[PDB]
Paper text:
We have previously shown that the transfer of crystals to X-ray data-collection pins can be automated through the so-called CrystalDirect approach, which relies on the use of a thin, low X-ray-background film as a crystallization support from which crystals are recovered by excising the film with a laser beam and attaching it to an X-ray data-collection pin. The CrystalDirect system enables the automation of sample mounting and cryocooling and can contribute to closing the automation gap that currently exists between crystallization and X-ray data collection.
However, in all cases tested the automated laser mounting and direct cryocooling after liquid removal with the CrystalDirect robot produced samples with very good diffraction properties leading to high-quality structural models.
Numbering used by the authors: -1 to 160
The structure:
Amino acid sequence: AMAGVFTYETEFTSVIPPPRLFKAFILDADNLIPKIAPQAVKCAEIIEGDGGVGTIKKITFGEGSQFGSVTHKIDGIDKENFVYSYSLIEGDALSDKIEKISYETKLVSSSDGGSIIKSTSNYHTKGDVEIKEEHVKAGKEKFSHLFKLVEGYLLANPNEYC
């Protein structure tokens, strides 16, 4: 019955500055990503709410993740600060031990004109805590692969998301 939070933070960088990344990778994710990378994401569907805080959306993956799915609740969005926070409320990463995972994606500017893409994962734990580096890294790599696809597209299509 011990409740705790395990926090993991990772970053990487992009030549694309925060406004363009946020508009595409975050704000237009539901339309952009299945169009760009159908094998990753088949579709995204709002179950409830209008797009703000409290919205509940289900993401159905493509073949790359066996047409599985996740359901997310939007926790916050701070468009001027390029910050998006959401919680996993259904998915394979939940378990008896892990009741919820709360995330933040924050885009920070660098003085070279680029972005730092920061990802924070907060695992809400119950009982004994057993969190494996392998599962955390697999998560990290799935995020970055997906991000890199969107980045690829934006570089190839410089008129979109201006």
